[PDB]
Each structure stands twice: as structure tokens, then as C-alpha cells.
Amino acid sequence: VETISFSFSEFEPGNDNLTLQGASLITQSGVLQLTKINQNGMPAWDSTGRTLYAKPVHIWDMTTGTVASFETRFSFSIEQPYTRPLPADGLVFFMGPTKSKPAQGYGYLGIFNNSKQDNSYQTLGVEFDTFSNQWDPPQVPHIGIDVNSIRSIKTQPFQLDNGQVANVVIKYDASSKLLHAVLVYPSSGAIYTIAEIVDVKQVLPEWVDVGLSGATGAQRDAAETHDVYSWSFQASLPE
Amino acid sequence: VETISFSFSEFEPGNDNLTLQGASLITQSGVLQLTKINQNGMPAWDSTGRTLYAKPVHIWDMTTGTVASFETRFSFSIEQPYTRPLPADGLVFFMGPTKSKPAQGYGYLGIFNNSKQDNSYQTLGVEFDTFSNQWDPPQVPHIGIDVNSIRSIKTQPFQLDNGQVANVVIKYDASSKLLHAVLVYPSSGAIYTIAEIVDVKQVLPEWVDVGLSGATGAQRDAAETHDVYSWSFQASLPE
Numbered sequence: 001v002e003t004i005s006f007s008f009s010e011f012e013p014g015n016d017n018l019t020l021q022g023a024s025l026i027t028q029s030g031v032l033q034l035t036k037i038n039q040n041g042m043p044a045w046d047s048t049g050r051t052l053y054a055k056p057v058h059i060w061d062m063t064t065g066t067v068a069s070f071e072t073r074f075s076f077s078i079e080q081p082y083t084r085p086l087p088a089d090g091l092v093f094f095m096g097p098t099k100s101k102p103a104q105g106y107g108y109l110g111i112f113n114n115s116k117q118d119n120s121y122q123t124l125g126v127e128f129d130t131f132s133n134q135w136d137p138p139q140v141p142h143i144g145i146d147v148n149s150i151r152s153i154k155t156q157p158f159q160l161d162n163g164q165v166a167n168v169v170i171k172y173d174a175s176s177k178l179l180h181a182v183l184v185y186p187s188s189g190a191i192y193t194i195a196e197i198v199d200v201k202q203v204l205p206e207w208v209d210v211g212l213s214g215a216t217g218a219q220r221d222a223a224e225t226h227d228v229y230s231w232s233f234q235a236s237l238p239e
Numbered sequence: 240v241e242t243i244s245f246s247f248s249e250f251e252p253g254n255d256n257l258t259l260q261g262a263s264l265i266t267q268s269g270v271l272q273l274t275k276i277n278q279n280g281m282p283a284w285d286s287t288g289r290t291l292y293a294k295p296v297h298i299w300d301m302t303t304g305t306v307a308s309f310e311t312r313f314s315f316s317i318e319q320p321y322t323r324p325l326p327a328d329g330l331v332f333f334m335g336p337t338k339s340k341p342a343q344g345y346g347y348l349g350i351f352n353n354s355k356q357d358n359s360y361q362t363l364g365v366e367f368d369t370f371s372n373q374w375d376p377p378q379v380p381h382i383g384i385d386v387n388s389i390r391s392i393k394t395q396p397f398q399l400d401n402g403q404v405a406n407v408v409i410k411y412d413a414s415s416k417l418l419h420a421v422l423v424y425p426s427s428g429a430i431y432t433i434a435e436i437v438d439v440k441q442v443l444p445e446w447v448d449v450g451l452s453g454a455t456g457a458q459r460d461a462a463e464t465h466d467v468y469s470w471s472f473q474a475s476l477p478e
């Protein structure tokens with residue numbers, strides 16, 4: 001069994017194991033701000049930011065045919081301060097090719113370039129979508145499981161607790177090829193759950209980068225915050 | 240689509256839609272006590288109690304070949320007041336043949352008669368096991384998915400927050416034959432999750448009874464409480 005794991009109760013500026021891209025930034029108070037926040041303390045539009053763990057993770061081995069089981073936990077808060085226009089765009093937990101750079105922003109959440117399903121992406125993502133695009137279901141916000149496409153294969157609407165901290169748990173069992181995610185708002189006690197079959201062996205490359213990505217809207221004030229307070233990850237490749 | 244749903248924020252004594260069996264009892268304060276509590280306020284051993292919704296639910300149709308998607312939510316607390324011996328036995332959410340009576344107590348949680356896998360049971364259960372029997376994994380308590388057998392096909396250890404209220408969400412997606420359950424302890428913020436493939440069409444009869452069951456140990460003081468504070472259920476059979 002080879003393993004890998006990190007666990008941040010809070011974030012520390014200048015930490016080497018974290019790669020910040022785009023607007024992504026860590027405050028001295030220990031919080032990770034994926035998207036830009038102005039001097040007046042309010043969310044800026046047309047912003048994209050990502051954070052990747054500096055070490056690649058071995059998700060599966062082509063030689064032995066074994067695939068790893070993994071689990072990730074993080075807590076974040078999304079604040080939508082504007083009355084109008086509609087807020088955007090959301091944040092995602094993703095896995096993909098190592099040494100990747102930010103893709104398209106807005107509805108693409110910084111991890112995709114278009115709305116076409118392209119196995120060439122080799123990207124798996126669990127999104128918390130706050131804006132309804134042409135490819136999205138009517139309800140927002142919604143949790144979505146993205147496999148090589150911004151058009152989720154599965155979707156689950158949820159109630160946003162504006163400014164409140166949400167706890168997320170995403171788990172993958174290699175034995176059943178089952179990916180289950182959970183969203184919990186400690187404040188209200190609300191619980192949301194999504195699950196779906198995902199063959200990691202058919203989607204991702206043997207080695208991947210794990211990260212978080214966030215993005216704000218394409219027009220003035222179509223924004224919200226994407227703050228992350230903690231993040232842990234663990235993977236186990238048997239053989 | 241035919242549907243059915245109930246939602247109890249609290250329990251009311253004398254409610255007609257609830258069938259109490261065994262020691263099961265509802266207090267005037269609105270709580271459902273599955274297992275007996277003595278005059279000294281402490282849990283009694285050798286106790287078994289169950290509660291079933293008085294109306295059967297159509298889980299699948301053999302004629303159209305359609306299967307229903309369902310979701311159930313309930314909150315409970317288990318208090319293990321004795322230093323010794325080890326506490327037992329746990330509680331379960333189950334689905335099975337309509338008009339059923341309590342089965343064996345103790346490790347069988349009141350829904351099974353033996354440890355043998357018998358498709359004749361036609362019982363599906365999500366257990367919160369507090370005692371480790373010969374057929375259980377070493378770790379207790381643990382969440383377990385039971386399909387026609389007390390020997391879970393899947394298990395997940397969890398940390399008991401003695402006397403604290405736990406929130407549970409069990410969901411079944413007919414499209415993926417996926418059963419995902421979640422346990423959350425609001426107090427500590429702990430989150431546990433289990434998921435597995437279950438073909439309801441192959442396990443349960445077209446019509447079933449949904450209920451909760453609890454049981455205490457086979458020897459003096461091998462007990463704990465099994466209190467339920469709320470319970471809601473919803474099912475949707477398309478066609």
C-alpha cells in the first residue's frame with residue numbers, strides 16, 4: 001500500500017506544499033481566498049483562482065491494475081452580497097493531469113475550456129455551482145459530479161446558507177467504483193448527499209494533481225466569495 | 240409517479256400511523272424509546288422494540304419493472320452509561336415484508352433470526368451496531384448495510400458521542416442502484432459516510448414496511464439507550 005495525506009486545520013502563508021494559481025491567496029488569519037476580494041471587502045467579478053497540492057498523487061497503477069481509494073474533506077463559505085445581478089460562478093474540488101494551469105473561468109470554474117465532453121480532459125470534479133448556465137439544470141446552487149465535462153453526469157440542488165461555513169466530505173471506494181459526496185451546514189443542520197459510479201481507471205491518468213478552484217462572473221457584480229478554511233486529503237493504492 | 244411520505248418533528252403518543260412493537264414506547268415529551276428504560280432512568284438489558292409506519296410502501300412494480308427512489312431521515316441518541324460490561328446491541332432502519340413481527344433480539348437487532356444469509360428474509364437494513372459479534376468486524380460502533388443477513392456486506396466504523404444526538408440521512412437512487420447513508424454528530428461536527436450497490440428489485444418484495452428497531456444485550460447491564468427524536472420518509476415510484 002503506498003499512501004499520501006495532508007491535513008490543514010488552517011492555511012499558512014508561504015507553505016511549500018501548496019501551489020497558488022491565479023487570484024488564489026492565503027490571508028495572515030489563515031484562510032484561503034480562491035477569488036479576489038476588493039479593498040472595500042467585497043467580492044470582485046471576473047476572477048479565477050486555484051490551489052493545488054504540490055505533490056502529485058498515485059491514483060492507480062496500469063501495471064498491477066489496482067486503483068486507489070481516497071477521501072477529502074474541506075470547509076468553505078460562499079457569500080453573495082449583491083442584490084443584483086445574479087451571483088456566480090462557484091467552486092470545485094478537482095483531480096487531473098499533473099502540472100496543470102488554470103483553464104477557462106466563469107461557468108467553466110477554471111478547470112475546463114468548453115462545454116464539450118472531451119475524454120482528453122482527464123479531469124474529475126465535484127462542483128458547487130452557483131450560476132445556471134445553458135448546460136446546467138435550472139436550480140442553483142447545486143452540487144455536481146463532473147467527468148471530463150462541465151455538464152455534470154449527476155446533479156443535486158441545495159440551499160445556500162449565505163456567509164455560513166459548509167463542511168464537505170468526498171469519498172471514493174475503489175471496490176465499488178463509487179463516489180459519494182456530502183455537504184453539511186452545521187448552522188442549520190442541513191445535509192445534502194450525491195453519489196454516482198465513476199471508473200477512475202477510465203477517466204484519470206495514473207498520477208494526478210488534487211486541488212480547489214473558484215471563479216466569479218463575467219459581468220460587474222456577478223460575484224461572491226469562495227473562502228476555504230481547512231482541507232485534508234488521503235489516498236491509498238494497495239500493491 | 241405514486242408517492243408516500245411522512246415527517247415527524249417529534250412523536251405524539253397514540254398516533255395511528257405508527258405501529259409500536261415490543262418495548263417500543265413514546266413519551267409525553269415526544270421522544271420514541273425503542274428499548275426499555277427503568278424507573279431509575281437507566282437502560283434495561285434483554286430488551287427489544289420496533290416501530291413501523293402503519294402504511295405499506297410500494298417500492299417497486301413487477302409489471303412495469305420500475306423501482307422507487309427513496310430517502311429517510313431520523314435523529315437519535317445512544318447513551319452507554321455502564322462501565323462494564325460492554326454495551327449492546329444497537330439500532331437499525333429497515334425495510335421488509337409487510338405485517339412483520341419482531342425477530343430475534345441481541346445481535347440480530349430484532350430483524351433477523353440467525354446469522355445465515357437467507358434471501359427468504361427479503362430485508363434491507365442500515366445498522367448502527369454497538370457490540371461486536373462473531374460475524375462483526377472488530378471495530379464498534381459501526382454503520383453497516385445489511386442485505387438479507389446480519390453479516391453486513393459493507394461496514395464503516397464511527398466514533399460514538401455518548402448521549403449526543405446524531406443525524407442520519409439514508410438515500411437510494413434507483414437509476415444507479417446506489418444506497419448512500421450519512422451519520423452526522425452536530426456537536427462535534429463529525430461526518431461518516433457509507434455507500435454500496437443494492438438491487439432493491441432482487442432483494443425486497445413489491446410492497447414493504449419501513450421501520451426502526453433497537454435491542455439491548457443478553458446479560459445484565461449490557462445495555463444502552465436507543466432514543467429517536469424525529470423521523471421522515473419519502474418514496475417515489477415512477478409509472
Ligand SMILES: OC[C@H]1O[C@@H](O[C@H]2[C@H](O)[C@@H](O)[C@H](O)O[C@@H]2CO)[C@H](O)[C@@H](O)[C@H]1O
Nearest residue numbers: 088089106107131133216217218219222
Ligand atoms: O452574469 C454572470 C454569468 O455571465 C455569463 O456570461 C455572460 C456575460 O455576463 C454577459 O455580459 C454576456 O453578454 O454574455 C455572456 C454569455 O451569456 C457566464 O457565462 C456565466 O458563467 C456567469 O459568469
Ligand SMILES: OC[C@H]1O[C@@H](O[C@H]2[C@H](O)[C@@H](O)[C@H](O)O[C@@H]2CO)[C@H](O)[C@@H](O)[C@H]1O
Nearest residue numbers: 327328345346370372455456457458461
Ligand atoms: O453481552 C452482550 C452480548 O451478549 C451476547 O450473548 C452472550 C451472553 O451475554 C452470555 O452471557 C452467554 O454466555 O453467551 C452469549 C453468546 O456469546 C449477544 O449475542 C450479543 O449480541 C450481546 O447482546
Ligand SMILES: [Ca+2]
Nearest residue numbers: 107129131133
Ligand atoms: Ca454554472
Ligand SMILES: [Ca+2]
Nearest residue numbers: 346368370372
Ligand atoms: Ca452486533
Ligand SMILES: [Mn+2]
Nearest residue numbers: 129136144152
Ligand atoms: Mn453545474
Ligand SMILES: [Mn+2]
Nearest residue numbers: 368375383391
Ligand atoms: Mn454489525
